[PDB]
Design a protein around this nucleic acid. Sequence first.
DNA 1: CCAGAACAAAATGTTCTG
DNA 2: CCAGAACATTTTGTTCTG
Lengths: 74, 79
Amino acid sequence: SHMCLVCSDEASGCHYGVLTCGSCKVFFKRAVEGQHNYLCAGRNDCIIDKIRRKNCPACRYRKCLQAGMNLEAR
Amino acid sequence: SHMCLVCSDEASGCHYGVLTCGSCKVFFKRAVEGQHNYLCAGRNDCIIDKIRRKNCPACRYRKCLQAGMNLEARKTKKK
DNA sequence: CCAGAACAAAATGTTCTG
DNA sequence: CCAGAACATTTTGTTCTG
Ligand SMILES: [Zn+2]
Ligand SMILES: [Zn+2]
Ligand SMILES: [Zn+2]
Ligand SMILES: [Zn+2]
């Protein structure tokens, strides 16, 4: 397709198994490797789009996983 | 009290007219000196505590405004 | 073309100085 | 005590290298 499946910015290729942009790729790797235990400040349903992808690591990461991102993709 | 009224961290003094920590103080000064065209990803009531104050500058700024913060606070107090 | 590194920028937080 | 500044860290994002 065309746009990132996590944040709807334009995607840069298939990363960790899913079409995504560069920032989401590294965010996802950092999230998993850092074990940050992110906590949403709203209702676990934050809108994650181009401007607001910084707004909630908990929801962004959740949206990553739901899109099927995984580190040992291939 | 001595906890920040914006985020409930340890307040460090009365800054721009309200008990706040140093981080909220400078966050507000910066929001006020420049642009604060932020956008909330939830429902404009995000919970602002020590860790999550980073998540939503839109709501963090709102809770500063709502607490009465203003730059001329200290000068107005001397009047 | 992609993962991870390395570099860079944005955003946040702390100590210094008037 | 508290303002702004200066210094410092964190967080996110882009380009480079394997
Ligand atoms: Zn993305
Ligand atoms: Zn959220
Ligand atoms: Zn605070
Ligand atoms: Zn918010």
